[PDB]
Structures are given as C-alpha cells and as structure tokens.
Design an enzyme around this catalytic site. Sequence first.
Site, PDB file in Angstrom:
ATOM      1  N   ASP B 185       1.384  -2.134   1.558  1.00  0.00           N
ATOM      2  CA  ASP B 185       1.725  -1.092   0.589  1.00  0.00           C
ATOM      3  C   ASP B 185       3.143  -0.622   0.901  1.00  0.00           C
ATOM      4  O   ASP B 185       3.349   0.110   1.884  1.00  0.00           O
ATOM      5  CB  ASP B 185       0.703   0.056   0.634  1.00  0.00           C
ATOM      6  CG  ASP B 185       0.961   1.229  -0.326  1.00  0.00           C
ATOM      7  OD1 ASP B 185       2.066   1.249  -0.976  1.00  0.00           O
ATOM      8  OD2 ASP B 185       0.082   2.175  -0.396  1.00  0.00           O
ATOM      9  N   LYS B 211       9.540   5.424  -7.629  1.00  0.00           N
ATOM     10  CA  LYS B 211       9.981   6.055  -6.392  1.00  0.00           C
ATOM     11  C   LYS B 211      11.389   5.577  -6.120  1.00  0.00           C
ATOM     12  O   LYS B 211      12.040   6.065  -5.181  1.00  0.00           O
ATOM     13  CB  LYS B 211       9.029   5.824  -5.229  1.00  0.00           C
ATOM     14  CG  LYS B 211       7.604   6.261  -5.477  1.00  0.00           C
ATOM     15  CD  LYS B 211       6.789   6.105  -4.214  1.00  0.00           C
ATOM     16  CE  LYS B 211       5.350   6.424  -4.516  1.00  0.00           C
ATOM     17  NZ  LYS B 211       5.288   7.807  -5.059  1.00  0.00           N
TER      18      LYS B 211
HETATM   19  C1  9ZN Z   1       1.928   5.054  -0.030  1.00  0.00           C
HETATM   20  C2  9ZN Z   1       1.612   5.218  -1.417  1.00  0.00           C
HETATM   21  N1  9ZN Z   1       0.928   4.258  -2.083  1.00  0.00           N
HETATM   22  C3  9ZN Z   1       0.616   4.426  -3.393  1.00  0.00           C
HETATM   23  C4  9ZN Z   1       0.985   5.551  -4.109  1.00  0.00           C
HETATM   24  C5  9ZN Z   1       0.599   5.550  -5.447  1.00  0.00           C
HETATM   25  O1  9ZN Z   1       1.674   4.867  -6.055  1.00  0.00           O
HETATM   26  P1  9ZN Z   1       1.504   4.611  -7.646  1.00  0.00           P
HETATM   27  O2  9ZN Z   1       1.424   6.103  -8.191  1.00  0.00           O
HETATM   28  O3  9ZN Z   1       2.622   3.801  -8.238  1.00  0.00           O
HETATM   29  O4  9ZN Z   1       0.040   4.167  -7.977  1.00  0.00           O
HETATM   30  C6  9ZN Z   1       1.734   6.572  -3.466  1.00  0.00           C
HETATM   31  C7  9ZN Z   1       2.075   7.725  -4.189  1.00  0.00           C
HETATM   32  N2  9ZN Z   1       2.171   8.782  -3.426  1.00  0.00           N
HETATM   33  C8  9ZN Z   1       2.305  10.125  -3.907  1.00  0.00           C
HETATM   34  C9  9ZN Z   1       3.051  10.925  -2.851  1.00  0.00           C
HETATM   35  O5  9ZN Z   1       2.918  10.664  -1.623  1.00  0.00           O
HETATM   36  O6  9ZN Z   1       3.792  11.810  -3.311  1.00  0.00           O
HETATM   37  C10 9ZN Z   1       0.834  10.572  -4.099  1.00  0.00           C
HETATM   38  C11 9ZN Z   1       0.330  11.576  -3.028  1.00  0.00           C
HETATM   39  C12 9ZN Z   1       0.696  11.038  -5.559  1.00  0.00           C
HETATM   40  S1  9ZN Z   1      -0.259   9.217  -3.875  1.00  0.00           S
HETATM   41  C13 9ZN Z   1       1.985   6.385  -2.092  1.00  0.00           C
HETATM   42  O7  9ZN Z   1       2.678   7.295  -1.346  1.00  0.00           O
END
Ligand code: 9ZN
Lengths: 392, 392
Positions: B185, B211
Amino acid sequence: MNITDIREQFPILHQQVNGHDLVYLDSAATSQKPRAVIETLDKYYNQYNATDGYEGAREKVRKFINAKSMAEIIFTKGTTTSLNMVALSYARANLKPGDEVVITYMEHHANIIPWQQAVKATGATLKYIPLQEDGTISLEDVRETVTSNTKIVAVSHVSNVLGTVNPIKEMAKIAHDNGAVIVVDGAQSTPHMKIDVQDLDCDFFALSSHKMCGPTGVGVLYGKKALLENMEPAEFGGEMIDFVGLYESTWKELPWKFEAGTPIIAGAIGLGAAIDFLEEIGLDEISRHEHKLAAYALERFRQLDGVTVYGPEERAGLVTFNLDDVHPHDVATVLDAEGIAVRAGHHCAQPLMKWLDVTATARASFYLYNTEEEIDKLVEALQKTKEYFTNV
Amino acid sequence: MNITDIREQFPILHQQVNGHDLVYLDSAATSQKPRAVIETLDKYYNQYNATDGYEGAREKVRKFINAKSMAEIIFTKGTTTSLNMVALSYARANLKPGDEVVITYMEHHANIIPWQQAVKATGATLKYIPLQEDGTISLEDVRETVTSNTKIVAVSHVSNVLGTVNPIKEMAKIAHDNGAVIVVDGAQSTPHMKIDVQDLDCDFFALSSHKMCGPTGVGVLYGKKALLENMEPAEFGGEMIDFVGLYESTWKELPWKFEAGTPIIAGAIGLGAAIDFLEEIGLDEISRHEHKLAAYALERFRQLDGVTVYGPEERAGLVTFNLDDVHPHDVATVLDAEGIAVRAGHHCAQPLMKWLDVTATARASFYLYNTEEEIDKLVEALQKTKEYFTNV
Ligand SMILES: Cc1ncc(COP(=O)(O)O)c(/C=N/[C@H](C(=O)O)C(C)(C)S)c1O
Ligand SMILES: Cc1ncc(COP(=O)(O)O)c(/C=N/[C@H](C(=O)O)C(C)(C)S)c1O
C-alpha cells in the site's frame, strides 16, 4: 418550462466547435451540468469543515426516488458498480442449482455479465425474455419466462439503444408472484422522469449521477431495507466498520455497511444539487419536453431515405439509427465536423447489436436543454451526409 | 526548489479562514491541486473528442513508478478498491487451509479487513508482524513471522499514523525466499518520493491520485504482468469484455480486463498532469523538503510540555500526537478557529490506536507547499491551546 432560461444555465452550450454552435446530442452518455451544480462542485475544491452536506445529500436522494429510509440509499462508484454489488452480495448468496435468473436481450453488459458469473459460480441457470419485433417486451413473454424457479429478474428501465421504457412495475408483480426479486437498472430512466420506488416496488434500483446533471464518479444503489440487512458487504475498508479486531470485524449499520473506503463527499453533495435543480424544473415538465423532441425526431427521421431507426414509436428521448451503406463511426465524424455530437458504437449492448444484425449504430439522445431546431440541424446534416457518401 | 514559486501554483493557499491565512496541514488526507492540474480537469468538463489522453496517462503512470508494461497499470476507484481487488482476485484464489497471510499492526483498515475476509473464506490463517517500541518493523520480526507457509505479505510503504517508512524492498526478498507475494500500500509513499517497482520488486503496489496533486476518484493498482494474467476480474461490465455471449463472455487483454464500466478519462488525464507537475519539480527535491520539515517539526514538538508524539525519528512528512488531557477533536476545532488544518480521529487504524493506548490522535502532515513558518504557527497554536484548556 422555458428552454432559453434552461439553456442559459449550461455554459457549455455556448461553446463554438469549428465555427458552429455546439449541438450536443449525447446526453445518454453524459448530461451536461448547470451553473448551480458547477458552483457546488467548485466549492468542494477549496477549504471546508461537510458531513451535514453528505448525509443531507443522501436524504435528498431518498426523497427524490421516494425510498422509505436513508438506510436504503447507498453511494457507489457508478451503476456498473451497483449492479456488480447486487450480483455479488445478493445473487451469489441466494442461488443454488435449479434456480433461474432472467434478464432481457436489451441489457447493458453490466446488467448481463455479473449475472452470468453469479450463475456460473452457484451452478444456477440464466434465461432471456425474448424481444418483440419493435424491441419491446411483452408481459406474456415475461409471464412465460419467469418460473417459480426464478429467484432474480434483472431489467433496464429504459434501453440505452432502443429507447424502450420497460413495464417494470408489472414485471415486479410477476417476479414477486413467482418468489423472485427484481433488479432495475434505472441509469437511463432517472434523469428523465419521476421515480417512485414504492409504487414500482422494485427490490433494487440503480441510477447514475452523471446522466442527471450531477458529477461523475457517483452512483446510487437503492435496495429494500430487509434485503440489504441480510446481504454481506462487497468491499471492505474505510468506514463501513464498527469494530476492527485482529481476526474478526463488525460492520456498521445501513447504509454505511455498503460504502467501503473514502466517502465521496463532493460527488454526493453535487448529486444533491443536481436533484435540487431538476426538481425546481419538474421531472414531469422534463419528460413532456422529451416526448415532443422524440416524436419530432422520429417523424423527421422517417423523411430521410435509407436511414434505419431502431426501437418502438413510444420511447424515451433517444434514437439509434444507421445510414444505409455508411459506417456509424463515419457519420459521427462528419457530424462532429459540423459541431453535432452523437455517439457511434455498440453502446455496451453487444447481444442486442447482434439481434438487430448490425455491428454498430449511431445514437442521438435528448435532454432538457435540447430543441427542435437542433433536431433539424441533425436531420439536415444526415441528409448532407447521405449525399456526401453516395458520391465517393 | 523554490517554495514561493510552488505556493503560487496552489490558488487554495491564498484562502483566508476567519481573517487568517489558510495553514493547510492535512495533505496526508488530500493534497491540494496546482493550476496545471486544475486547468486540465476544467478542460475535460467542456466538449471533447480523449483516449489518446487516457492511454497516454497510463503510459505516464507506468514510466512514473517504472513498471515494465502498461499491461501492469490498472486504473481503479482508489487504493481501497485496489487492495480489495487483490484480496478477491489474488488472495481468494491462492489460499488453502494452512496458508498464511501476514500483515502489520500499523495497517489502514483497507489493508486489514480484505485479508481477514480472504482468510475466512479460504479457511487460511492471518498473522501479524509485531511492532517495535518506536513503531518500526524489524527485519528479524518479519523473518520470524514469515513461514514457508506464507503466501501473501501485505504492508503499508509509509504509515499514515506513525510516518514510519517500512523496509519494503527487503520485505520483498523475505517474502520471495518463503514462496510468497508482497502487496504494498503506497498511498502515503508515492506523493513524496520516487517509486521504482522493479527495484522494490513488489508484486502489487497501490497509489492514490488525490494524495499526489491529482483528482480524486482515481487509484492505480500495479501488479506484475504474470500475476495479473492468471487473476480473474473482480468486476464485470463496460469495456473489459472481448466477446459477450448469452451465457459465456471473454475478457479483454491486460490492463483492460480489470477496468469494468465506464473509463475514468478526466481522472486519469488529471493524474497524468499531476505526474508531469511533480516530475518537473523532482521527487527527490520534494523528499528533501519534507525531511527538513519533519525534523523541524519533531524538534519543535519536543519543546512543548505534555504533548506526546508517536512513531520513529526517521519519518515521512507527518506527525501524529496528543495533548495531555485534551481531546484531539478539540485541538482540531481550536486550530480551525486559527485557520490551521490538521486532522483528528483514528485515521482508519483502529488496531494501531488500541496498540498506542489512545482512542484518537491529531495529525499534521506536510507537502511540497508547506514551510517552517507554518510549523511555527502550529507549535505556537498548540501552546496557546494547552494554556487555554488547563484554564477551564
Ligand atoms: C495508507 C492508506 N491507504 C489507503 C487510503 C485510502 O486511500 P483511497 O481513499 O484512495 O481509497 C488512505 C487514506 N487515508 C486517509 C488519511 O490517512 O487521511 C484516511 C484516514 C481517510 S484512510 C491511506 O492513508
Ligand atoms: C443502461 C446503462 N447502465 C449502466 C451504464 C453505466 O453507467 P455507469 O457509467 O454509472 O457505470 C450506462 C452507461 N451507458 C453509456 C451510454 O449508453 O452512453 C455507456 C455505453 C458508456 S454504458 C447505461 O446506459
């Protein structure tokens, strides 16, 4: 309903293409968006909180299609994703050898293949209601095709190729009488006419935001609360969880059980503004405008020599056709040269293309901002095109 | 790399909030977008053809992460969808009782639950690499946790809570030595540093466009061609089909096998422009800017009394913390009052929150447009906040 006032709302209609006025006749693929919607999505690409707006939009969607509860309105990536979800969480868990699923020959691929895979995996059987000559279904045919072995009927509310409006309220009755649920693909109906899921009594209903003046990236899957309660999620992550253990997790309540990953806030709020817009015009008003355009188009198309039109007389606001002798891709090209935008292709209806004995078609589709004068430009340019090509 | 020049590119940074300058420290959730990207997405919400652009963007993505082939770059709805896809098409078809899948305690829900479900359905077992005190993994721990029964290791490249950069190149070696694939990931790594999937030798890699200065609605799933060739699709419809029969259908070749439904044209082209932008700045240049900010932030946070910071010293550009005695939601509220935007919550890391013995945290995250002066505003406002609350 005043067409000038309406057209003033879509900045894209003022676009010149090759020194001509845009004549935009591909709404069935993507509507355009009015100023109110555009401003809304601009707002959610500057700095914010948001979830008043998100859940507020779910409520507007629920009232819009007249669902009993917000628990029954799920946001998804699109009608394709919606239908895949029902095939995976509903179909794969409710079919056993001997069970039938019945669909039609007019279906979108996303309303064919997921049922194919669901049937292969459960060892059940897939069945097709035959079509009439004019591209309609008859209630007799459904009555005959549904057995008390049928567990799922799936049908387009409006066909994206033929413009046929399927008798879905009646099909719901026939499915229920046999012990089946009905799944309705309303991608092409929802932008153009009132939907009332209680009166239609469909078990699932799917709509596409970008066909109805809203942003893309967002669909809605409606399902009856009771069906949704027993379905297991199709996707896992984000915010559909209550407790996450090390081995074992619990889901949230409906509707959030079905929304894995990162909430589509701007998209939903955008769809809500699109709904606000269409409602202030009146869907009935829209639908009457489209009947005029469609009757007009079919009549003026009958004046043209050696163009075939497909589908019935009574129809949603679209006509699919071919010029004798000319490739639809070529038609689309020439009309583009004149600023007229129609779509050519198989429209993700390969079976239906084979049934009409054609590999492709052209399609003009109409919405609340189209006019008879645009239909004239289309007919004139189709004439200009038949001549231009009999001459090479 | 000149921060003024860069900041001029993000119109949203000129936004006043409550008479203060926006101080935007939530990039880990969504970056902002520069003018070049914004203009690009504006262009694809007026009238068009398009697929030169779409496939062109796939090529830019492939070159960007240094994939061998476009066949290995799939567009998806997001990293959550990406990970679910690998769990359904790869994991559910390659696990048998006795097989292990190993993950870490620092994972996003979308990198936990899909593996949980894949293991329940195949009757295999899920295992966790333990964490060090400082929130890092040690290669010893992975070496111990991976058995020659391990079929899949799944790991965040960068943690969204701890800012730990996991040794994924080495973990790939350890997974291979045992007969396993690795799933990475890279949502939090890709915006901030060069990715080279050949050198990392990951088997799957997932990144999030929003991001990294691109539009939302779009993720990329990288997988090795050979793995992808044997995976069956997760979703069916649209344009992933070659022939649609009545009962039986054939898929397109890679990568289109994995893209059901309606191609995300604007989103991909947007991601491509975001890539063009980041590349013209240099990812190395970005990464060095973030190391300065992170060292600076951690040092200035050590000056503050009774704030806990989580994670190691060496870190990506984010710090997660708590004020002694104060609820993180409350911190976020007060900083909002001052125009400072940090996020509070569990960050979809419930397990990890439990491990740190906390129900929530606040998080400030940094990107190419942040500065030391913004970190000062954060530290000063955190001070102002500790006082303001010891006083009620
Ligand atoms: C490590 C990791 N993997 C997946 C995601 C979700 O990504 P996506 O929204 O493109 O489905 C995220 C999205 N992260 C946001 C954040 O950390 O601000 C979340 C908390 C909404 S998942 C992420 O950090
Ligand atoms: C009946 C019907 N069902 C589903 C879709 C796909 O909707 P969505 O893109 O929201 O997944 C569509 C989209 N139709 C386009 C069209 O007809 O222009 C399509 C050919 C791209 S599928 C559709 O007509």
